[PDB]
Design an enzyme around this catalytic site. Structure first.
Site: not given
Length: 160
Positions: A74, A86-87, A90, A117-118
């Protein structure tokens, strides 16, 4: 940029990076109770992969809990500090994490999406529809009515 599994070993260095990550989680998830974030992060069942910048600056990470014999894990918390978004971090983080879970013989990842975050998890291959039966994670992973439980399959021989 390093993507390292951070162990809570009671050392000043490691515990400092874990607190740093906890603080990032707290800021990126304002509604999540901070004391609860601390509880899970320093829990004996939880582990964290951090995005280490320049060998000492954590700028993001994933706090997860493996259910080893069950082969699923999980994702409790996931975030990238605001000024480092935005680099491409993620995606790189989730990829490094998937690679790690693959090596750990974990075949499914589960997470209750932050709603904000979906879009990210959908982007990382997670789905609202499950391939793993609830009976499988029942008694291991909590069943909440609120929040969206999303799942991601980790293929044994896909290059992550």
């Amino acid at each position: 940029l390093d993507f390292d599994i951070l162990t809570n070993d009671g050392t000043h260095r490691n515990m400092k990076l874990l607190i740093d990550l906890k603080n990032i989680f707290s800021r990126q998830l304002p509604k999540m109770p901070k004391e609860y974030i601390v509880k899970l992060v320093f829990d004996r069942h939880h582990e964290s992969m951090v995005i280490l910048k320049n060998k000492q600056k954590v700028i993001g990470g994933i706090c997860f809990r493996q259910y080893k014999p069950q082969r699923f894990a999980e994702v409790a918390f996931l975030a990238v500090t605001a000024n480092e978004q935005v680099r491409g971090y993620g995606t790189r983080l989730m990829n490094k994490f998937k690679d790690h879970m693959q090596k750990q013989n974990i075949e499914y990842l589960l997470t209750y999406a932050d709603n904000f975050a979906i879009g990210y998890f959908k982007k990382q291959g997670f789905t609202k529809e499950h391939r793993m039966p609830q009976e499988k994670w029942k008694g291991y992973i909590k069943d909440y009515d609120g929040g969206t439980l999303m799942e991601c399959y980790i293929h044994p021989y896909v290059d992550y």
